[PDB]
Structure 1
Amino acid sequence: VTRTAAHTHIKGLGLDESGVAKRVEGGFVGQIEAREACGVIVDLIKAKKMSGRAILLAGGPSTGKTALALAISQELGPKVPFCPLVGSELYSVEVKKTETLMENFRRAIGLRIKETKEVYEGEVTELTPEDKTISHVIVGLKSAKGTKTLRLDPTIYESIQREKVSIGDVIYIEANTGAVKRVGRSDAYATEFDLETEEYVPLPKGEVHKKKEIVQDVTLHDLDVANARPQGGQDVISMMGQLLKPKKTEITEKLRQEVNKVVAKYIDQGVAELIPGVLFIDEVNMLDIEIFTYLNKALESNIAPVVVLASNRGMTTVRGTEDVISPHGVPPDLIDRLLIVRTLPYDKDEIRTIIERRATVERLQVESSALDLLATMGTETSLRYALQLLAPCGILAQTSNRKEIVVNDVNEAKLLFLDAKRSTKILETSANYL
């Protein structure tokens, strides 16, 4: 019914209008500074003015950095574009990591447009040249409420020849795009043959010419791929244009200058509205020194929005460097333009509320003795081992036909499943590399 995978219990940060964060609100217990400061970051994205700001989230495991990342991604809403990304994913062999990094900086930003398109539909009456010719075809579309004849290009006529239409077939033709879809044979010719593979559709109601306006949103990187390589078409020249060089290449700066030039012309006409977004990079310590040094100049660039990082290390060696020792795996020049939000750990009662609220979201019933036992396992092995063992206790409750988690079920979970320190303690004694 409802799939829960270490998430979906958080519906945002849950802050007040004054700013003060509650103790128990929105799937969060404790962590006041990262939630309230994270809401300051939420308003900072809602400013639509700031750019180049980089805020890393540094902390230990089971502390709530990625959960805070889903808290800001849920607090922003669907209208603000969110780009999840891992630093291990930026390595590519088709192009460099620079093109994927700056390309992702063009993936964070969004831009909503509004445009009107013309819709034509009707039953095909005549396909004939004009009177003399170079071979164009007047297509007489018979609609219900009107009958009109229209002259078309040879390419859309070629797609009309592709759709195998004839006299008396309902088609769908778009003016600005040129795409052709056939609905089927009209209902007037259903009695011509007793059995036919072509389905019989009724006549389309309404006029021949129709107009509507869409508030469709499309990312600026999608306009960059639309400016980079040919995608598809229904003709041979467009499909071979796709088939010839479909391998993605690096993009020059002048192309982005013309893209945001005509985009700036669209925002000068009042049509579109520029809204920034979020590029969230997971495991920043796995990045190379080249991506760090291009992040130095990339954060000095203009269009780079509020980028949130997540690094789970300290004074370690940077990847790509031999003797450089720096905090968080980040070079000190990039760490100078970074902002650190320290994550706070959780007590025994806060582990009890994590297991409690995770149990209520997981729709399992836990008794108080098993809740205190899972609290002691939360303060003995790990948090992820108790949250990992919430489900097998309910499974053993289902096999034992019980509706609540008991002491013998979680002790049977202790016997059937082992944690880290029992695994290391068992693997310490070896006959032949146990």
Structure 2
Amino acid sequence: VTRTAAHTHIKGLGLDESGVAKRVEGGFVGQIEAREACGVIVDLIKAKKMSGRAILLAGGPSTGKTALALAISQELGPKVPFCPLVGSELYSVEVKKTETLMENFRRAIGLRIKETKEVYEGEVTELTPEDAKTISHVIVGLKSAKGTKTLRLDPTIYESIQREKVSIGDVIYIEANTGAVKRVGRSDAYATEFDLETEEYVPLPKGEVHKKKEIVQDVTLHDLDVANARPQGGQDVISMMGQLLKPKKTEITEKLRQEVNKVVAKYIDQGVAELIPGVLFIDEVNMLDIEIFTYLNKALESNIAPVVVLASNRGMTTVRGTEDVISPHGVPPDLIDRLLIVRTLPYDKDEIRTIIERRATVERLQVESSALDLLATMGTETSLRYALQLLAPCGILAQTSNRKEIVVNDVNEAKLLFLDAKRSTKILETSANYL
């Protein structure tokens, strides 16, 4: 029916019109100040005025950094682009890392294009082309269940009609704006010309021949970059088997970016398009090499760079690519000057109990209060995530004994069966041959 995976109880940041958070609202328990910071960053992003503003939120593990980033993505909405990313993904074997960083930058700038869709489909009743060896135009009559409609067509479309092997009696699909020609099959009225035939027989379309539909097209800048930078060349509409030569990714020059920017700027002022900047979210930013950290400096100073959100859970750690550079959170001091650091405090007993109750609610499980106190003491004793992930084995072991509700004994059984990190380390230390 429904699926949950360590999330989906996060619906938003839970703020009112004055920007003050409630205690338990939006699936969030506690964590006031970081939620205020996230709401202010959401409002700054919705202001749609800034480029290169950066945010790093740091804290201990199992504190809610990814939950805050997902709450930012839910509060912003699905129209604005949101690009989740792991810092380990930037190490590719086909292109350089700075190239992939620039593509993930330009994946976070979206567009909104107002388009229309008009479609002619139905029964082909007339295929009369006229010349003046070279045809001048073809007049095609279309028929549906609500009437007929004849059209005049150009020979360029007639070439695709000839390619689709369309004769009298077939059901076709004409999109007038694009020029797409699609053959559906022969009609049900021509099903009895032969006892056995190799053609498929479809009924008539029950609607009108002409249909109009308003659509909104969303594209990012990276799609427009990759559409003009095909090294082999363009592709056809129907390609079930690929090209004989493998197209690999190539580094895209800044000149093509300048031309794509010129085209989008020429299309914006006519009211055709609407520019929507978005979010590039990078999780585990300490995994980055120092050269990516240096190119991040130049990429943040661009005029079309999006708002970048980073996360970390390290302390006085040497940044990778170096030997003796001790820096906070795994971010070098050059990049951390341009950053804005939001802290993330850990939790006490009652918020952990509230989180356990909230996640037991969303998984449709019923727990007694006595087992709830045991799970809260387990979470404070061992880990919050260890109390998180024992809920579904408790539900399974309760359902095994024909019970819909969790008791203490199932929690003790799951405690005995599944171990945490510290008990496994204790077994590892008191062992003879590799556990």
Would you say same fold, with TM above 0.5? yes
Task: Please show how residues 94-113 of structure 1 align to structure 2 within 5 Å.
Answer: 94-113=94-113
Per mean C-alpha deviation after superposition, the further-off stretch among 408-417 and 213-222 is 213-222
Contact residue 230 and residue 241 of structure 1 kept, 8 A = no
**TM-aligned CA distance change 1:147 to 1:41, over 3 Å:** same
**TM-aligned CA distance change 1:386 to 1:199, over 3 Å:** same
**TM-aligned CA distance change 1:235 to 1:343, over 3 Å:** closer
| Deviation for aligned residue 1:57 | 1.1
**TM-aligned CA distance change 1:232 to 1:168, over 3 Å:** farther
Contact residue 58 and residue 341 of structure 1 kept, 8 A = yes
| Deviation for aligned residue 1:118 | 4.7
| Deviation for aligned residue 1:194 | 3.8
**TM-aligned CA distance change 1:343 to 1:154, over 3 Å:** same
**TM-aligned CA distance change 1:366 to 1:244, over 3 Å:** same
| Deviation for aligned residue 1:183 | 2.1
Contact residue 136 and residue 154 of structure 2 kept, 8 A = no
**TM-aligned CA distance change 1:155 to 1:411, over 3 Å:** same
| Deviation for aligned residue 1:43 | 0.7
| Deviation for aligned residue 1:198 | 3.0
More helix by share: 1
Contact residue 232 and residue 238 of structure 1 kept, 8 A = no
Q: Deviations over 1:141-170 (max 9, x none)?
A: 556777777676666445434433222212
| Deviation for aligned residue 1:32 | 0.1
Contact residue 87 and residue 281 of structure 1 kept, 8 A = yes
| Deviation for aligned residue 1:174 | 2.5
CA–CA separation in structure 1 for the residues paired with 2:235 and 2:149: 25
Contact residue 116 and residue 211 of structure 1 kept, 8 A = yes
Unaligned ranges ≥5, structure 1: none
CA–CA separation in structure 1 for the residues paired with 2:405 and 2:144: 65
**TM-aligned CA distance change 1:231 to 1:136, over 3 Å:** farther
| Deviation for aligned residue 1:398 | 1.2
| Deviation for aligned residue 1:361 | 1.1
Contact residue 356 and residue 388 of structure 2 kept, 8 A = yes
| Deviation for aligned residue 1:404 | 2.1
| Deviation for aligned residue 1:130 | 3.0
| Deviation for aligned residue 1:346 | 0.6
DSSP-derived class of the 1:3 partner:
coil
Contact residue 135 and residue 155 of structure 2 kept, 8 A = no
CA–CA separation in structure 1 for the residues paired with 2:136 and 2:325: 71
DSSP-derived class of the 1:243 partner:
coil
Contact residue 186 and residue 202 of structure 2 kept, 8 A = yes
CA–CA separation in structure 2 for the residues paired with 1:92 and 1:113: 32
Contact residue 184 and residue 200 of structure 1 kept, 8 A = yes
Contact residue 83 and residue 281 of structure 2 kept, 8 A = yes
Per mean C-alpha deviation after superposition, the further-off stretch among 224-233 and 360-369 is 224-233
Task: Please show how residues 124-143 of structure 1 align to structure 2 within 5 Å.
Answer: 124-125=124-125, 127=127, 130-131=130-131, 132-133=133-134, 139=140, 141=142
Which residue in the other structure is 2:117 paired with?
A: 117
| Deviation for aligned residue 1:195 | 4.3
**TM-aligned CA distance change 1:211 to 1:24, over 3 Å:** closer
CA–CA separation in structure 1 for the residues paired with 2:347 and 2:7: 18
**TM-aligned CA distance change 1:113 to 1:350, over 3 Å:** same
CA–CA separation in structure 2 for the residues paired with 1:433 and 1:390: 30
**TM-aligned CA distance change 1:329 to 1:234, over 3 Å:** closer
**TM-aligned CA distance change 1:20 to 1:133, over 3 Å:** closer
**TM-aligned CA distance change 1:159 to 1:242, over 3 Å:** farther
| Deviation for aligned residue 1:306 | 1.0
CA–CA separation in structure 2 for the residues paired with 1:236 and 1:25: 48
| Deviation for aligned residue 1:186 | 2.7
Contact residue 121 and residue 173 of structure 2 kept, 8 A = yes
DSSP-derived class of the 1:371 partner:
helix
| Deviation for aligned residue 1:231 | 9.6
DSSP-derived class of the 2:141 partner:
strand
CA–CA separation in structure 2 for the residues paired with 1:318 and 1:367: 47
| Deviation for aligned residue 1:86 | 0.5
Contact residue 318 and residue 325 of structure 2 kept, 8 A = yes
Per mean C-alpha deviation after superposition, the further-off stretch among 379-388 and 147-156 is 147-156
| Deviation for aligned residue 1:190 | 3.1
Q: Deviations over 1:89-111 (max 9, x none)?
A: 11111111111111111101111
DSSP-derived class of the 2:241 partner:
helix
Which residue in the other structure is 1:278 paired with?
A: 279
**TM-aligned CA distance change 1:233 to 1:93, over 3 Å:** closer
Per mean C-alpha deviation after superposition, the further-off stretch among 278-287 and 127-136 is 127-136
Contact residue 119 and residue 175 of structure 2 kept, 8 A = yes
Contact residue 155 and residue 235 of structure 1 kept, 8 A = no
**TM-aligned CA distance change 1:19 to 1:134, over 3 Å:** closer
| Deviation for aligned residue 1:261 | 1.2
| Deviation for aligned residue 1:365 | 1.1
| Deviation for aligned residue 1:248 | 2.1
| Deviation for aligned residue 1:191 | 3.4
Q: Does 1:44 align with 2:61?
A: no
CA–CA separation in structure 2 for the residues paired with 1:280 and 1:246: 28
| Deviation for aligned residue 1:5 | 0.9
Pairwise CA RMSD: 2.8
CA–CA separation in structure 2 for the residues paired with 1:307 and 1:12: 19
| Deviation for aligned residue 1:116 | 3.4
DSSP-derived class of the 1:151 partner:
strand
Q: Deviations over 1:378-419 (max 9, x none)?
A: 111000111111111121111122232222211111211222
Which residue in the other structure is 1:392 paired with?
A: 393
**TM-aligned CA distance change 1:336 to 1:255, over 3 Å:** same
| Deviation for aligned residue 1:288 | 0.9
Task: Please show how residues 33-432 of structure 1 align to structure 2 within 5 Å.
Answer: 33-125=33-125, 127=127, 130-131=130-131, 132-133=133-134, 139=140, 141=142, 156-204=157-205, 211-229=212-230, 243-244=244-245, 246-432=247-433
More strand by share: 2
**TM-aligned CA distance change 1:148 to 1:242, over 3 Å:** farther
| Deviation for aligned residue 1:176 | 3.9
| Deviation for aligned residue 1:424 | 1.4
Which residue in the other structure is 2:12 paired with?
A: 12
Number of aligned residue pairs: give it: 434
**TM-aligned CA distance change 1:432 to 1:188, over 3 Å:** closer
| Deviation for aligned residue 1:212 | 4.1
TM-score normalized with structure 1 length: 0.91
Contact residue 42 and residue 75 of structure 1 kept, 8 A = yes
Contact residue 232 and residue 242 of structure 1 kept, 8 A = no
| Deviation for aligned residue 1:226 | 1.6
| Deviation for aligned residue 1:358 | 0.9
CA–CA separation in structure 2 for the residues paired with 1:305 and 1:6: 28
CA–CA separation in structure 2 for the residues paired with 1:124 and 1:189: 12
| Deviation for aligned residue 1:209 | 6.0
Contact residue 284 and residue 310 of structure 1 kept, 8 A = yes
TM-score normalized with structure 2 length: 0.91
